[PDB]
Every structure is written in structure tokens, then in C-alpha cells.
Design a protein around this nucleic acid. Structure first.
Lengths: 113, 80, 154, 60, 127
RNA sequence: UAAGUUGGGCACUCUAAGUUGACUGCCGGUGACAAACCGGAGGAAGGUGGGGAUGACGUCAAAUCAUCAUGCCCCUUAUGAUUUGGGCUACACACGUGCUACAAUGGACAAUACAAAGGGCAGCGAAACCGCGAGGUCAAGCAAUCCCAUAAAGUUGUUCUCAGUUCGGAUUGUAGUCUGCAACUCGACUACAUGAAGCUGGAAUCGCUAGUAAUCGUAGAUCAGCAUGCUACGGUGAAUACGU
């Protein structure tokens, strides 16, 4: 419904809708919604009238909102450029952490091979 | 004193049980004698270091043979 | 009609089916010598079996007409070579083989509680579609459909 | 396992730094003294009622 | 010592591996109150036990061999009774009032050839 | 009546820390010229108590300079050696082996009642510090005890619901443990994120008897980076023979 604006998955697992949404990889999908009678029978928007409201209150009350967590993650990129690590001179080229440039190719970052 | 008596083998503990009763007899106080110690142990084999067929670690056994003969009222002549 | 069998000496009186198979299935699926408790665990969903079905549970427990090892291929290495030959089951062996056939070859599909799905898998089991009922046709396909040798009896 | 701990105390094999020297026949390996084969706990019981001239009070 | 106990009751001998101390009686390794077919006197099934005064002082953990529907019941009680005889000599003198040694002086007679029950016969069949 | 019992050596058990009866030997039992061992009440000890231990002289060097002696060998500013540029793990993995999640006749995670073989003056824990976890407690006693006991079943979670769902102790990478100097160019635990393939299974092979095989509990001979394999016995230990 209005959980992410335009519901990607439709007519499927209730916790499968949080799988397509970035920020969670089905590790805390059933650890965020703890409302009364918060079950699921393969019906995200089916057999349900009021349940997303409580899920939107626990997702906003949590430390990570959903875009601010990725905002700081996409803002530390230049913050980790103090002659340290975090692919300082790795992402620019093709080599990535693990030195797999000799073992094989650059699957991490590779323009054309 | 409530002290044990760990000698070597069976006769080694037998001669130590009569020798401790002699030294305790010298002192002028109550002395004990025989001490019930029902047999109870186990055995096992493994490997050593070089070559020595079976029965690893050339030793007699893991028997916990001991005793409990001592003195009750130790005086100044109880040292001998 | 083998006169010589294995010394069985077993008892299974049942006052719910008036026979010796209901208690035989209560002693086949029994664990840690559970007799009285077995009935309690069998009557725990017994009412649900006749409530989640349109037929009579007593006669349903028509689902027992497709779980018998008609002719299972056993092990006799015939003629000095390692080969497999099928054998015929005995009346007092197929009943005990099929009784626990759904208690070991029907544990991959379950739902709801722990004793209501047993009847759920029990219903629509005659029609080949399950796993424990798939061994019935697998038994005849392991001995008859593929021709083999039969002289090595046991 | 006190009998198995009172047995393996000075076992000398390939490594002699594995055996731990403790109470010869008694227990209480800690909170005592070990240097000349005489633990305080054992010595106290071995000097009970003034046995061998060892258990004293002070007297400078 | 209270193992390998000999106790026969109407052709129903059964050995008992009773252990001193623990009192976890688990006949057939489970419930023994809802197993016996009949046995109305489930609590009064052990008559010598009362005089033995060792109800919760020994764990059965044994089994039953042969016997009948209710003939297999009240057989482990004598099985542990003989096991208590070797476990303590005081029991023998403690159960001198009762002293159950044999309680099977007859068998079970039913349908038979020639005679009805090989002893009785039909007499004036009621009309 | 402090599982460091604080007692009364208070009453003796189930008792530890030298063995014992017992086992052939008449035995109930007759071999026919003929004992007997089985087992009868035999004692708890089904009979060497139950039992084991036992490596008889050997055979294969099959193995050993890299298991060493040596018929003895291999480097002489390099095969050593005070030791970094740096190592046989991280790439397709080609196997044995390391547990593993493939399911509702059920998952991770509550409190949690009950032996242990062994560990310990620096180290074990009752609500407490340590109850998802990899650890940062000094420490009562300081080793029959005391600690593991927050172990286990016949007596219990939960919960997500014919499945990728709160079912996945794989990879991967900032990073906490173990070591971070030789991992830049050699290991991992469970997590802040990644958490695969995976619905009983390959080429091919391996496994099954009421205090024990197994199994809730479960174990090291131990290297300054691998414990995730059987490894200790109180009780869950439920089951035991068409056929010679």
C-alpha cells in the first residue's frame, strides 16, 4: 500500500514485501512487526485492513529510518578517503578487497572484459 | 594426624604399615594398626614414542595403593 | 502359507474397531512403550479426522487400499553374481509394513497442528499423489514391471 | 577425581613441564605453600597437636 | 543387588532390574496405571509392597513375559519381591506374616475336545 | 544436620583408599564300563565370579636419513643461520574426511529440577556478573567436597506456518572475539550488514541389541591464528533373533 509508495510484490508472502525493499535481507523481517495477531498466510494486502500502520510506526521509531541509514553510508565514502582502506584506490580501477585480480578477473568492479 | 601412606607395591605398603606402627609405638600415646582399604582401580593401553609392542609407558600400573597409619597424640619424642 | 514363521507372541485388543489392527497401529507408532498415552495421542485428533473429512474415519484410516508392499525386491545374489530378486510379503507382515508406511514416508508434507495434518495426508491418499502411497506402485515397479529372476526365493 | 589428581603430580615423560607439583598426599593446591614438598593445609594436619617441630605461633 | 528377580504368577514370570535409592518405577518404560487392561485394584496391586515399606525406595524399569490380559499384571511385584530377598535378608523376616511364594495352584480351562472343559459337562440344558 | 555439613566419629548405610566367595568339585543330571562340566536354593555373583588382559616362535622393511641407528647420508657466504621482500589455506576445487539447515508426525532464541571423566593461586560458578554469541569480573573454598549442576528424557517453551516464510553455524567484505608482525602475497567463532545452493541426494560408497553400540549430557593426545570429527558414564538406553 503506502509502506513504500508503490507495492512492488503483490499477492504473496506478507514478509516477502520487505525482501524487495532495501535495508533488510529477511534477517529482521519478522523481528520488526510484533503487533497483536501479526500472522501471515501468503496475503500481503489480502485478508488485511489495518496492520501496515503499526509496521510504519515501528520502522520510523527504530534508529534506522530507511533512507538516512543509506545517506550516511553513501556519505562516508569520501569520509573514508583519509589515506586508509575502504577501496581508497580500488573502486577507481578494478581490483577489489581479496586480491582476486590474479586468481581470476574483477567481478566486483569491471567496465568491459 | 589423618595422613595417608603411598609406598611402592603391595608388600612395599605392607612393610610401611608395620614400620609406622613401630615409630608410633615409641611415643607414649594411643596407636592404631590394620586399616581397611578395599581394592578398586582400572587399566588401559595406547602408544609410547619409539618401538615397544603393546602396553605403552613401561610402568607397573595406575594402582592408587596407599595407607592411613599415623599418630594420635604426638609429643616431643614422636619425631623419632 | 508358510507354516514356519518368526515367534511373534504379541497382543493388541482394541474396543474402538473390534479387531487387532487399531492397537497393532497403536503399538507400531508407539515410542518408549506408550500404550495408554498412544490412545490419548491417537484420540487427540481422532475427532478432527472425522471432522476434517466427508467419509467415516474408521473406514478411512479406503486410504488403506494403496499402501501395501505387494512384492518388494529383496536381497539374494543369485548364481554367484550380485543381483536383486523380489519376494512375496506375508499377511502378518504387509499390515505392519503399511501401518507405519505413512509414519515414515509421509513426514515431508504437514500443516496446521501435529495430528490434524496426519488425517489431511490420510485424505486423498488412495489416489497416487503422496510419497508413502508412491512406494506402493514403486514396489510393483521394483519387481514386476522390470522383468528379473525369481528362483532365488527368500 | 581427587585420586586421579593425587596420582598424576610429578609424571616425567617427553615434557617434564606438564606435571604440576602440588600437595603430595593432601589437597588445597592453592592458598598454601609449595617449595620443599610441604603444603600448609597438609603440614597443619601433619603437625596436628604439635607433631614434627614445624607448626609454631611466633616467638620471634 | 535387586536385579534378575524371579516372580511367577499364573504362568507369567518377569525379571526386574530394581536399583537401590532411585524410585522411578516405569513398567514398559512409561505409565503402568493406564497400561494394564483391567486390574481394578491398580493401587492395591502390590500387597507385599505395603509390608515391604519400600514403595518409593526402588525403581522397577523392567518388563513382563507371557501371562494373560490381566495375568501379566501383579507379577513384577513378586519379581522385585524376590529381588529384595537378595537385596536385604531383613525383608524375608519382615514379610513372614504374608510370604508370597506361589499363587498359581491352577491354570485356565476353556473350550476343549471330548469333555466341555475336560472336567465338567452339560447337565439339563435350560429351555 | 553450611554437597567447602558448622555439629555430636551423633546412627550406617549405597560407599570410596589392601581383596574377597567361586567354581569345578561330588554337584539334581549318568557316561557304561566313564568322567563330567553345565546348572539344580546355590549365596548378588550362570559359573575362567561376568570376564578380559595374553602378543606364542613369525611374515611382510610394507614404513623410517624426512621414526632413528646407520652400508649411512644432502648443502661448505647457501639446504643451515639473528630473520624480513615473503610461504604449502584464500583460486575451478580433483577426494577422503569437519558438523551440517532440507522440515509443521517442526526452526534459531525463555526462565530451566536433578551424576560427570577432567580443569584450576589466578583459574571453575546458584537469581548476580556471562543466558543467542564469540568474552572485560576481581572472587567465597581455594582440591573425594566446593565449580561446571544455567547439564537431560519418561515430566515444558516460544514462534514463524505443504514453504526460501523468525527453517539455513556456506561463501563474501568495513568489523568484535583468536592471533593480527611474516594474512599486502597463508586460518576461523557467532554477529552491524551477506547470510548461497538445500524438500532426502551424484561418479561412488558407507552405516544398525532396556544404565551401554549409538542417543538428551556428552570427551584432546593438544601448536602463541584450524575444536566445526568418534573420545567420560549417573540416569533419557524405548528394541532384541524364520535360519544353520
Amino acid at each position: 500500500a503506502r509502506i513504500a509508495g508503490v507495492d512492488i510484490p503483490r499477492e504473496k508472502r506478507v514478509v516477502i514485501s520487505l525482501t524487495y525493499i532495501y535495508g533488510i535481507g529477511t534477517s529482521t523481517a519478522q523481528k520488526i512487526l510484533e503487533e497483536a495477531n501479526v500472522s501471515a498466510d501468503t496475503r500481503v494486502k489480502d485478508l488485511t485492513d489495518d496492520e501496515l500502520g503499526r509496521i510504519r510506526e515501528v520502522v520510523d521509531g527504530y534508529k534506522v529510518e530507511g533512507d538516512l541509514r543509506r545517506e550516511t553510508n553513501l556519505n562516508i565514502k569520501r569520509l573514508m578517503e583519509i589515506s586508509s582502506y575502504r577501496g581508497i584506490r580500488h573502486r577507481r580501477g578494478l581490483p577489489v578487497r581479496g586480491q582476486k585480480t590474479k586468481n581470476n578477473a574483477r567481478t566486483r568492479k569491471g567496465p568491459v572484459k | 594426624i589423618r595422613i595417608r601412606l603411598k609406598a611402592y607395591d603391595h608388600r612395599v605398603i605392607d612393610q610401611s604399615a608395620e614400620k609406622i606402627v613401630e615409630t608410633a609405638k615409641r611415643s607414649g600415646a594411643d596407636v592404631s594398626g590394620p586399616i581397611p582399604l578395599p581394592t578398586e582401580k582400572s587399566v588401559y593401553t595406547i602408544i609410547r614414542a619409539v618401538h615397544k609392542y603393546k602396553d605403552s609407558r613401561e610402568q607397573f600400573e595406575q594402582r592408587t595403593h596407599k595407607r592411613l597409619i599415623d599418630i594420635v597424640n604426638p609429643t616431643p619424642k614422636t619425631v623419632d | 502359507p508358510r507354516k514356519g514363521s518368526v515367534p511373534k507372541r504379541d497382543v493388541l485388543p482394541d474396543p474402538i474397531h473390534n479387531s487387532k489392527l487399531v492397537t497393532k497401529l497403536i503399538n507400531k507408532i508407539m515410542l518408549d512403550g506408550k500404550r495408554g498415552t498412544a490412545q490419548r495421542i491417537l484420540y487427540s485428533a481422532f475427532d478432527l479426522v472425522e471432522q476434517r473429512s466427508g467419509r467415516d474415519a474408521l473406514e478411512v484410516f479406503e486410504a488403506i487400499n494403496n499402501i501395501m508392499p505387494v512384492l518388494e525386491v529383496k536381497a539374494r545374489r543369485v548364481g554367484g553374481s550380485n543381483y536383486q530378486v523380489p519376494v512375496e510379503v506375508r499377511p502378518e507382515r504387509r499390515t505392519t509394513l503399511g501401518l507405519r508406511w505413512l509414519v515414515n514416508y509421509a513426514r515431508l508434507r504437514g500443516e496446521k497442528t501435529m495430528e490434524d495434518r496426519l488425517a489431511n495426508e490420510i485424505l486423498d491418499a488412495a489416489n497416487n499423489t503422496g510419497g508413502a502411497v508412491k512406494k506402493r506402485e514403486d514396489t510393483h515397479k521394483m519387481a514386476e514391471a522390470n522383468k528379473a529372476f525369481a528362483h532365488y526365493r527368500w | 577425581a581427587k585420586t586421579s589428581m593425587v596420582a598424576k603430580q610429578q609424571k616425567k615423560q617427553k615434557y617434564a613441564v606438564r606435571e604440576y607439583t602440588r600437595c603430595e598426599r593432601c589437597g588445597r593446591p592453592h592458598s598454601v605453600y609449595r617449595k620443599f614438598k610441604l603444603c600448609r593445609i597438609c603440614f597443619r594436619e601433619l603437625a596436628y597437636k604439635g607433631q614434627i617441630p614445624g607448626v609454631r605461633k611466633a616467638s620471634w | 543387588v535387586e536385579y534378575r528377580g524371579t516372580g511367577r504368577r499364573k504362568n507369567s514370570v518377569a525379571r526386574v532390574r530394581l536399583v537401590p535409592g532411585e524410585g522411578n518405577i516405569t513398567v514398559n518404560n512409561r505409565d503402568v496405571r493406564e497400561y494394564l487392561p483391567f486390574e481394578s485394584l491398580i493401587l492395591d496391586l502390590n500387597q507385599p509392597f505395603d509390608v515391604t515399606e519400600t514403595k518409593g525406595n526402588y525403581d522397577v524399569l523392567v518388563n513382563v513375559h507371557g501371562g494373560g490380559f490381566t495375568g501379566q499384571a501383579q507379577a513384577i511385584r513378586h519379581g522385585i519381591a524376590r529381588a529384595l530377598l537378595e537385596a536385604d535378608p531383613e525383608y524375608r523376616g519382615s514379610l513372614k506374616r504374608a510370604g508370597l511364594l506361589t499363587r498359581d495352584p491352577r491354570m485356565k480351562e476353556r473350550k476343549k475336545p471330548g469333555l466341555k472343559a475336560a472336567r465338567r459337562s452339560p447337565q439339563f440344558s435350560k429351555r
